[PDB]
Amino acid sequence: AKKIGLFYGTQTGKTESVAEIIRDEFGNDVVTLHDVSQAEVTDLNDYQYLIIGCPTWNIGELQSDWEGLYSELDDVDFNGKLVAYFGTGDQIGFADNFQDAIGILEEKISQRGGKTVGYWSTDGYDFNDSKALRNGKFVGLALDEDNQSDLTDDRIKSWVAQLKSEFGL
Numbered sequence: 001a002k003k004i005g006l007f008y009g010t011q012t013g014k015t016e017s018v019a020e021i022i023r024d025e026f027g028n029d030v031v032t033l034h035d036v037s038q039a040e041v042t043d044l045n046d047y048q049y050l051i052i053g054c055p056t057w058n059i060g061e062l063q064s065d066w067e068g069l070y071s072e073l074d075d076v077d078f079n080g081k082l083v084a085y086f087g088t089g090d091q092i093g094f095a096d097n098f099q100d101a102i103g104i105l106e107e108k109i110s111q112r113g114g115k116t117v118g119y120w121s122t123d124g125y126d127f128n129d130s131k132a133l134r135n136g137k138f139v140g141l142a143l144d145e146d147n148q149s150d151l152t153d154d155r156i157k158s159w160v161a162q163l164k165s166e167f168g169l
């Protein structure tokens with residue numbers, strides 16, 4: 001009815017499109033979408049299950065709107081919440097900072113108490129470095145519409161089935 005809050009930020013809409021797919025994969029009224037460009041850090045307190053969507057830009061930078069909300073995280077609490085992350089990036093043009101955005105967001109949110117779920121395998125990706133890594137895996141679903149648009153849909157399906165399990169749905 002109302003359990004998972006998906007807060008996303010997007011520059012050219014790729015991340016938003018993925019967010020809508022994620023929503024449809026979860027089932028009737030489970031997930032609600034929220035453009036962080038119109039959100040206050042306190043909106044995240046209304047959910048015990050969160051999905052953070054954010055593309056990486058300008059070589060390792062958080063998407064514009066997320067950058068603004070990011071600064072307010074240090075004053076909020078995420079303890080007791082399960083948080084998953086996903087983002088669009090470009091492993092070819094920016095192999096050294098692939099998906100840094102979700103890595104940055106995850107570090108901060110986990111630091112504030114959020115427990116991360118939804119770890120994703122790096123197998124099948126071609127990149128050099130990322131701030132979104134932990135124990136050999138991405139801290140969230142890594143999508144690449146610029147180079148692997150053909151893999152996004154099945155990657156989302158797999159990830160949602162994984163989260164349905166990890167969220168205990």
Ligand SMILES: Cc1cc2nc3c(=O)[nH]c(=O)nc-3n(C[C@H](O)[C@H](O)[C@H](O)COP(=O)(O)O)c2cc1C
Pocket residue numbers: 009010011012013014015016055056057058059060061063088089090091094097098099100145146
């Ligand atoms: C100037 C510029 C810088 C970019 N930098 C990065 C980067 O550092 N890391 C990454 O993974 N992708 C990077 N990208 C690729 C975007 O993340 C990718 O195209 C993404 O799908 C955009 O999603 P959005 O439309 O949701 O903003 C960059 C793209 C441009 C045009």
